[PDB]
Each structure stands twice: as C-alpha cells, then as structure tokens.
Enzyme design. Structure first.
Site, PDB file in Angstrom:
ATOM      1  N   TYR A 113       0.794  -1.208   0.000  1.00 22.93           N
ATOM      2  CA  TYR A 113       0.000   0.000   0.000  1.00 22.93           C
ATOM      3  C   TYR A 113       0.825   1.255   0.000  1.00 22.93           C
ATOM      4  O   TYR A 113       2.023   1.229   0.289  1.00 22.93           O
ATOM      5  CB  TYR A 113      -0.855   0.033   1.267  1.00 22.93           C
ATOM      6  CG  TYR A 113      -0.043   0.300   2.515  1.00 22.93           C
ATOM      7  CD1 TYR A 113       0.573  -0.738   3.205  1.00 22.93           C
ATOM      8  CD2 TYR A 113       0.141   1.601   2.985  1.00 22.93           C
ATOM      9  CE1 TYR A 113       1.359  -0.489   4.334  1.00 22.93           C
ATOM     10  CE2 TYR A 113       0.921   1.864   4.106  1.00 22.93           C
ATOM     11  CZ  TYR A 113       1.528   0.817   4.779  1.00 22.93           C
ATOM     12  OH  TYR A 113       2.304   1.078   5.888  1.00 22.93           O
ATOM     13  N   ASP A 148       3.575   7.551   3.241  1.00 16.47           N
ATOM     14  CA  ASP A 148       4.109   6.204   3.456  1.00 16.47           C
ATOM     15  C   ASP A 148       3.844   5.329   2.237  1.00 16.47           C
ATOM     16  O   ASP A 148       2.862   5.542   1.527  1.00 16.47           O
ATOM     17  CB  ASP A 148       3.458   5.574   4.696  1.00 16.47           C
ATOM     18  CG  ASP A 148       4.183   4.332   5.182  1.00 16.47           C
ATOM     19  OD1 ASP A 148       5.376   4.161   4.856  1.00 16.47           O
ATOM     20  OD2 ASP A 148       3.558   3.535   5.907  1.00 16.47           O
ATOM     21  N   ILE A 174      -5.873   0.053  12.305  1.00 14.77           N
ATOM     22  CA  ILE A 174      -6.968   1.002  12.490  1.00 14.77           C
ATOM     23  C   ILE A 174      -8.294   0.505  11.895  1.00 14.77           C
ATOM     24  O   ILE A 174      -8.302  -0.281  10.941  1.00 14.77           O
ATOM     25  CB  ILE A 174      -6.606   2.377  11.871  1.00 14.77           C
ATOM     26  CG1 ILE A 174      -6.435   2.253  10.354  1.00 14.77           C
ATOM     27  CG2 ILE A 174      -5.301   2.888  12.468  1.00 14.77           C
ATOM     28  CD1 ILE A 174      -5.961   3.521   9.681  1.00 14.77           C
ATOM     29  N   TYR A 195      -7.217   8.178  12.706  1.00 18.46           N
ATOM     30  CA  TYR A 195      -6.683   8.881  13.866  1.00 18.46           C
ATOM     31  C   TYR A 195      -7.404  10.220  13.980  1.00 18.46           C
ATOM     32  O   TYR A 195      -6.784  11.282  13.912  1.00 18.46           O
ATOM     33  CB  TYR A 195      -5.179   9.126  13.695  1.00 18.46           C
ATOM     34  CG  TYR A 195      -4.388   7.974  13.103  1.00 18.46           C
ATOM     35  CD1 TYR A 195      -4.390   7.736  11.730  1.00 18.46           C
ATOM     36  CD2 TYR A 195      -3.604   7.149  13.909  1.00 18.46           C
ATOM     37  CE1 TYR A 195      -3.629   6.708  11.170  1.00 18.46           C
ATOM     38  CE2 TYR A 195      -2.839   6.119  13.355  1.00 18.46           C
ATOM     39  CZ  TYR A 195      -2.857   5.907  11.985  1.00 18.46           C
ATOM     40  OH  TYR A 195      -2.090   4.913  11.428  1.00 18.46           O
ATOM     41  N   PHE A 245      -5.828   5.279   1.159  1.00 24.38           N
ATOM     42  CA  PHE A 245      -4.878   4.175   1.076  1.00 24.38           C
ATOM     43  C   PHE A 245      -5.029   3.342  -0.191  1.00 24.38           C
ATOM     44  O   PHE A 245      -6.128   2.904  -0.528  1.00 24.38           O
ATOM     45  CB  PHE A 245      -5.018   3.251   2.290  1.00 24.38           C
ATOM     46  CG  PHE A 245      -4.318   3.746   3.518  1.00 24.38           C
ATOM     47  CD1 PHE A 245      -2.936   3.649   3.630  1.00 24.38           C
ATOM     48  CD2 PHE A 245      -5.041   4.287   4.575  1.00 24.38           C
ATOM     49  CE1 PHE A 245      -2.283   4.084   4.780  1.00 24.38           C
ATOM     50  CE2 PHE A 245      -4.396   4.724   5.727  1.00 24.38           C
ATOM     51  CZ  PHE A 245      -3.018   4.622   5.831  1.00 24.38           C
TER      52      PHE A 245
END
Ligand SMILES: CC[C@@H]1/C=C(\C)[C@@H](O)[C@H](C)C[C@H](OC)[C@H]2O[C@@](O)(C(=O)C(=O)N3CCCC[C@H]3C(=O)O[C@H](/C(C)=C/[C@@H]3CC[C@@H](Oc4ccc5c(ccn5C)c4)[C@H](OC)C3)[C@H](C)[C@@H](O)CC1=O)[C@H](C)C[C@@H]2OC
Ligand SMILES: CC[C@@H]1/C=C(\C)[C@@H](O)[C@H](C)C[C@H](OC)[C@H]2O[C@@](O)(C(=O)C(=O)N3CCCC[C@H]3C(=O)O[C@H](/C(C)=C/[C@@H]3CC[C@@H](Oc4ccc5c(ccn5C)c4)[C@H](OC)C3)[C@H](C)[C@@H](O)CC1=O)[C@H](C)C[C@@H]2OC
Lengths: 107, 107
Positions: free
Chosen positions: B26, B37, B56, B82, B99
């Site tokens: 990912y 990321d 998550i 988050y 994502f």
C-alpha cells in the site's frame, strides 16, 4: 544536538558504514510543523553518500545512528543545520528542523 | 465511514477471515495529495492479522471486504483512523486518509 525519536523499526544491526550510499525518503518541516520539502512527493528517494559534504551536520550524525529499514523523527538544532546564515527561500534564520526520515536501503 | 473503490478486479470469492493474515502492499496519502508512506518503495509488504486490533478501524473493515488479488482505494474517515490526535510528525488531527491497498494473499 541531533535528536532521534524512532517511530518505525529497522533491523537494529546494519548501520551505514562510513562510505556507503544511503537511499532515504524524508519530509522536512519547520519547528511549527510546516512541511517545507518532501521527497515522497517527487516519488524519487534522495541518494546521498555518508561522510562527504552532502548533508547538513544533523543528517550526518542522525542517519548514522539509524539501522536499515528504520524511520525516525530527527529534530536538528539550529547549529547543526543552517541556523546562522539560514537558507534563502524556505529556511529562516535559527530555525530548528524536524525530519521524518525512512532509511530505505544501503548500497 | 469508509469508501472502497475497486481499482483492480479481485478474486471475487475469497475474502479475509477473522483470524487470518492479510499480506498487502500500500501507499498512504492525504486528500491534499501529499503521500506519507509506501511499502512498495521499501520492498516489504505489510502483514497483519484481521480482528486482532493490529490496525486502524478503516483498514479493519475496508480490508475485510476486499477479495484476494483486489486492489482498492480506501477513503477512511478520521473517526475510523486517527480522528482525535492523528499521529505525531506524520499525520495531523482530523485528517482523512486515502490508502492504495493491494490484497496480495492470505496466510
Ligand atoms: C541543486 C543543488 C543541490 C540540491 C540537490 C542535490 C537537490 O536535488 C536535493 C534534493 C535538495 C533539495 O532540492 C529540492 C532541497 O532540500 C531541502 O529542502 C532539504 O530538505 C534539506 O534540508 N536537505 C536535503 C536533504 C538532506 C538534508 C538537507 C541537505 O543537506 O541539503 C543540501 C543543502 C541544501 C546544503 C546546504 C548548502 C549551502 C551550505 O551553506 C554554504 C556552505 C558553503 C558555501 C556557501 C556559499 C558559498 N560556499 C562555499 C553556503 C549549507 O551549509 C549549512 C548546506 C543539498 C542536498 C546539497 O548538498 C546539494 C545541493 O546543493 C533543502 C532545504 C534545500 C535543498 O535545495 C533546494
Ligand atoms: C511501533 C511501530 C509499529 C510500526 C510497524 C510495525 C511498521 O512496520 C508498520 C508497517 C507501520 C508503518 O511504519 C512505517 C507506519 O504506517 C503508517 O505510515 C500507515 O500507513 C498507517 O497508517 N498504517 C500502517 C499500515 C496499516 C494501517 C495503519 C495502521 O494501522 O498502523 C498501525 C498504527 C500506526 C496504529 C496506531 C497505534 C497507536 C494507536 O493509538 C492508541 C490506541 C489505543 C491505545 C493507545 C495507548 C494505550 N491504548 C489502549 C494508543 C492508534 O490508534 C488509532 C493506531 C501500525 C501498524 C501499528 O499497529 C504498529 C506500529 O506503530 C502510519 C501512519 C505510521 C506507521 O508507523 C508507526
């Protein structure tokens, strides 16, 4: 000095030996979280050799303590970055820099 | 909530079971494009078990309904990610995340 707050683990053994090429992905931000630059946007990692005049002192000391695969929050004090002369453009004088560095590989 | 946009057609039949290991690849970015990321860049796929609270909420549900081989774009809402604090140095509070996750295989 140069602070190293680890957030993601590397191998914890292989630390860049003086003379190796480091392939990193970083995001530099000002003390107040302002993202001023990021290699992750360009989709091209930064390749710098350790030892030679290529990175600001902070990076020299900081990354050297990192192990392959590790990602950390390098908080570099003004004296270890630019600070004095600053840096024409995005780096004002006596600025404390935070770097989100992910050591991808060592060649 | 969480939105799932099927980029690549998956198996269409094999879905992750509560207790299995999902092996994925990912990249993570914010609404404002900025990536933060990518496992693809570090050549190491992300492994995690479903329902073991290793990830998550968004990933938990979003991935739970992704068949193997499937590549989807996840648009996770802050409350599923988050929402409250975000993540120091990388993710700001109240940020929505996108994502690009590929369900490689199961274990
Ligand atoms: C094209 C040029 C070439 C730039 C590239 C290879 C670019 O592709 C790379 C991707 C850099 C980025 O480009 C987008 C951009 O990245 C930043 O955003 C950044 O994130 C950063 O902080 N980086 C880069 C990542 C490693 C840490 C740090 C750095 O180490 O960067 C190095 C840096 C900037 C050092 C200062 C130079 C001036 C000295 O002052 C002196 C010293 C000697 C002097 C003078 C004047 C006369 N003399 C003799 C002044 C300072 O001494 C404290 C140190 C930089 C990599 C140089 O080694 C190489 C270059 O110059 C910088 C904020 C500004 C920089 O450039 C915009
Ligand atoms: C220890 C390092 C360890 C890191 C590794 C093993 C790395 O190898 C993996 C590949 C992770 C990446 O490292 C490059 C990196 O991936 C991100 O980039 C990312 O893409 C992301 O978002 N990922 C990772 C991929 C799956 C989805 C999501 C995630 O789920 O990641 C998980 C995550 C970040 C969860 C938060 C934990 C704290 C909670 O806060 C709470 C909750 C409950 C609490 C407390 C305190 C007491 N209680 C009871 C605190 C939060 O609660 C919402 C949720 C992550 C996999 C953690 O399980 C384990 C780790 O952090 C994160 C932006 C930051 C993260 O680096 C860190």
């Amino acid at each position: 000095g140069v602070q190293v707050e680890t957030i993601s683990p590397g191998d914890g053994r292989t630390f860049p030996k003086r003379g190796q090429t480091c392939v990193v992905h970083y995001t530099g931000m000002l003390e107040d979280g302002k993202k001023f630059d990021s290699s992750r946007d360009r989709n091209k990692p930064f390749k710098f050799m350790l030892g030679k005049q290529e990175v600001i002192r902070g990076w020299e000391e900081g990354v050297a303590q990192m192990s392959v695969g590790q990602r950390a929050k390098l908080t570099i004090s003004p004296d270890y970055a630019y600070g004095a002369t600053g840096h024409p453009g995005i780096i004002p004088p006596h600025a404390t820099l935070v770097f989100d560095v992910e050591l991808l590989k060592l060649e």
